[PDB]
Structures are given as C-alpha cells and as structure tokens.
C-alpha cells in the first residue's frame, strides 16, 4: 500500500466483504456456476451446486446479502429481558442484559478510538472486541469458548 498502493484496494474484516458485495454481480456468478455444472462436472460439481444454492436463492428476493453485515443493530423490548425487584429492595434481572451492555460499551469505545486515531492495529483489536459481543449476543456458544 506504500508502493503499488492505488493499483489495489485492500480492506479488513466485514468491511472488505461489504465492498466485494457492493461491486458484485449475482447472475454473472450464477451463470458461471451453471456453465460449471454443465461443462466442468468432475467431482467438484457438488461444490458448484451447493454454492449456486445461495446464488439462485438470492436472485428474485427483495433481500440483498447485505442483511448479513450489520450497520444498524436492533435491541429487544426491555420487558422481554425483564427486570423486576422483589419486596425488600433486591433486583432480579435477565442474563441477556450483560451482552447488550457489552456491545454498547465496545461501540462507544471504537466510536472514540476514531478520535484517538491509534494505528490500524489497535483499531483491529477493538473492532474484534466489539464484534465478539454480537458473536454471542445472538447465539452465545458458537465460536470457541463462550461468554
């Protein structure tokens, strides 16, 4: 990127994914897989098929694959992760709450790390640490050791 920079455009994390799906063709890759399954059969045809699954499933749908990547994350109605105190002065709160707060924290963390401007590597560490929160907020227990 110092020399030979403007000839290629490298990115990290889902950002890169975003880019390669924005400037991305579907029916072109679709017909590629079709001509593969009809011309380059061999044994790896199973892959052509299992892959055109998602492509021809992403063709007449009003949902681009962008839905995978999240630039706007919802929260659940408070009552569904209820919090109530018994008689005497002691609370009783859901367990999911924790994960939510973590996301929140990490967001703000990164949202001020931008003003800190630390090199891209501390930025990668903080982005990893913030998406580790969604990695388990939706289904904790999916990658390595859970929360």
């Amino acid at each position: 990127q110092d020399r030979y920079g403007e000839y290629f455009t490298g990115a990290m994390g889902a950002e890169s994914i975003k880019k390669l799906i924005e400037n991305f063709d579907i029916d072109a890759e679709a017909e590629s897989l079709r001509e593969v399954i009809r011309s380059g059969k061999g044994q790896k045809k199973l892959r052509a098929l299992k892959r055109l699954k998602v492509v021809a499933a992403f063709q007449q749908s009003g949902n681009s694959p962008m839905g995978m990547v999240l630039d706007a994350v919802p929260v659940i109605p408070p009552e569904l992760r209820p919090m109530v105190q018994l008689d005497g002065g002691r609370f009783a709160t859901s367990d999911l709450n924790d994960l939510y707060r973590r996301v929140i924290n990490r967001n703000n963390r990164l949202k001020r790390l931008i003003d800190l401007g630390a090199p891209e590597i501390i930025v990668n560490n903080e982005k990893r640490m913030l998406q580790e929160s969604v990695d388990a907020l939706f289904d904790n227990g999916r990658r390595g050791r859970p929360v």
């Binding site: 889902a14 950002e15 975003k18 699954k53 998602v54 999240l70 994350v73 939706f138 990658r143």
Partner: peptide
C-alpha cells in the same frame, strides 16, 4: 464498524462461504 451474523458465518455450510466462493 460493520459486523456480520454468526449463522451466515458459522452456518456449516457457512452462507458467506459460497456466495463469496471462499
């Protein structure tokens, strides 16, 4: 910073695994 959903990465088959060919 953008982030993804685990089902589309830990799909086994990972749904990004094929849409991207990676």
């Amino acid at each position: 910073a953008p982030v993804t959903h685990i089902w589309y990465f830990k799909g086994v088959p990972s749904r990004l695994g094929y849409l991207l060919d990676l």
